[PDB]
Amino acid sequence: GPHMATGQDRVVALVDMDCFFVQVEQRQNPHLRNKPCAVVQYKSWKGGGIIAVSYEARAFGVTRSMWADDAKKLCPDLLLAQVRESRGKANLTKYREASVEVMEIMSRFAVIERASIDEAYVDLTSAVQERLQKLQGQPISADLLPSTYIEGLPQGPTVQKEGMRKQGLFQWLDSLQIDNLTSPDLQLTVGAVIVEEMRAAIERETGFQCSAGISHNKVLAKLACGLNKPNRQTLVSHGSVPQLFSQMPIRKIRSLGGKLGASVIEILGIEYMGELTQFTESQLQSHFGEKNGSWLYAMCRGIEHDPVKPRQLPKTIGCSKNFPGKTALATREQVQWWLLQLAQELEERLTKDRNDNDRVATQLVVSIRVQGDKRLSSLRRCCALTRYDAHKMSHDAFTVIKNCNTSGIQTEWSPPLTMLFLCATKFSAS
DNA sequence: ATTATGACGCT
């Protein structure tokens, strides 16, 4: 009735860089621009594993996780850029620095939450109130929203993509009641104006294009961002949620793409996010736990309260390498050499971090995988991180993993190691 | 033999 809280109090955007590592490489090498191209890690095994794909190449079926040799079967003219290798491993510094460029631009408009190397949520509620006070009642011109889709429109009583985008936007803007600064649809619209400006600033100042979603919470903003890529933004209003969710597979919503979403589907006998509305909050909590159940109950109605956290920097700084199949580490000298390689990269990144961000890590986490273990991590052990020195860090990691060697020979390592991972955590202002 | 990250929930 009048006391139902519809979760329309915030304006939240999710900005995601289009095929990010590809764009970084295309900015650096103009010969790659506007071409089918992909970014690969390594090269010897099947041409390298693809981790990013330009939209031109996606049209040929090239995807992330493809081996480049297989991708070349789909797209023989595919161009490839390789991630830098340093100390025997992939080194992603170039992409982390490019990410910082984008994040610093976004931070000029509002508080952001770094959600990945190429995406950030934006809490625009306050910026929207500001812009609405500046608009002094003036209507919102379509010219202010030149790359915005309104999800669900056009509807009701041109066969070109841009024509439909414009028709839907016109329908939306024509319905807009711009006379109260408290309408959630108006607030979302102003949010989209701001996101147009933010995306223009990112492209002007970095060369990088991005997509974005604008809605009332993080989950809807992320979902919205995916609806119209690349180089476009999408507004998902509260009112669009019933129709949008009525045919939305459950796995498309962030956090439901894995085992939990599979159990929602199997236990409840449903397929689409909207079907969740027919269950009581207690029913959902009974199957999926109190937190998940309350979250699902609100989220299938378009409502979620998870805040945009004020955090532009990563909480951990880590280094990892797999040693698959026959290249697993089987001698103590091997394990120690690779721990040193990882620790040297970690030292370099940590020292840069301390200089840039006025903080120091205080905990070192060591994770390994042993051959024949199905898990991603066989074992995790922590120890104190008291100095940014790679030799000490690698000695300490060896000390906390040494008792895993079930070999009679101390020169051999059994069972061989298929993964090493060093992660610095628990940062403190320095 | 996708690999290299990173956040967060659970107990």
Place this chain on the structure above:
DNA sequence: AGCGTCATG
């Protein structure tokens, strides 16, 4: 603390 899940450039 150590383990598992989700995301996935």
